[PDB]
Amino acid sequence: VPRGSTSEVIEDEKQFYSKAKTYWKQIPPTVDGMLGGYGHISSIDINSSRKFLQRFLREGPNKTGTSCALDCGAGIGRITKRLLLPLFREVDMVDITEDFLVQAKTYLGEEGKRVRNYFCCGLQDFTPEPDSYDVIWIQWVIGHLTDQHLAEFLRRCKGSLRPNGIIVIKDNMAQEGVILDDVDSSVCRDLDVVRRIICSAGLSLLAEERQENLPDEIYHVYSFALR
């Protein structure tokens, strides 16, 4: 069978997290470090993310607001800089790697003065303030959490949404199963697994979209908008 949960592939959860922390600690605080050598795809990524988000910003009963966003596993703030700060009055960042948050303050420049909180914490230990965010953006990090921590984190995120708020997950998806990468200490899950986890967190799908124009050799990437 393919594997369907992280408990089938993670030998030692403390080591799964410690190894990941050690891996990111020796990556340079640059876009290419964030994107694993694929820094050149950033603009394609941000353009598609922007179009996806703008679906939820149109006027109407369910319009997502534009006061505050949370960037989860934000790194140096690639997404905060080019996608979120232009659209949200304030942005909070959370990441496990202190060096990245320190570099963010340089990387983000003057606009970075609208970053309110820089939280240096693992997602598995982070509880966002209730009723605080219009958008919670979670990109290229969910693979770093166990199934139980991911489900729990998505529940706490749900409790921190403002009225009409949404959660966006954008990540690599496996063709089938749950695949361990033992170098960066992360998993890649298939769409059925990810959807199962979203549902277990009491969330529903508003939209799902495949990222186009990526290099042929990398994992497929999908975006989900949730509430």
Binding site: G36, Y38, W140, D181, D184, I218
Partner: peptide, 6 residues
């Protein structure tokens, strides 16, 4: 992070 299919 984005990455080559293992």
């Amino acid at each position: 992070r984005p990455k080559r299919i293992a």
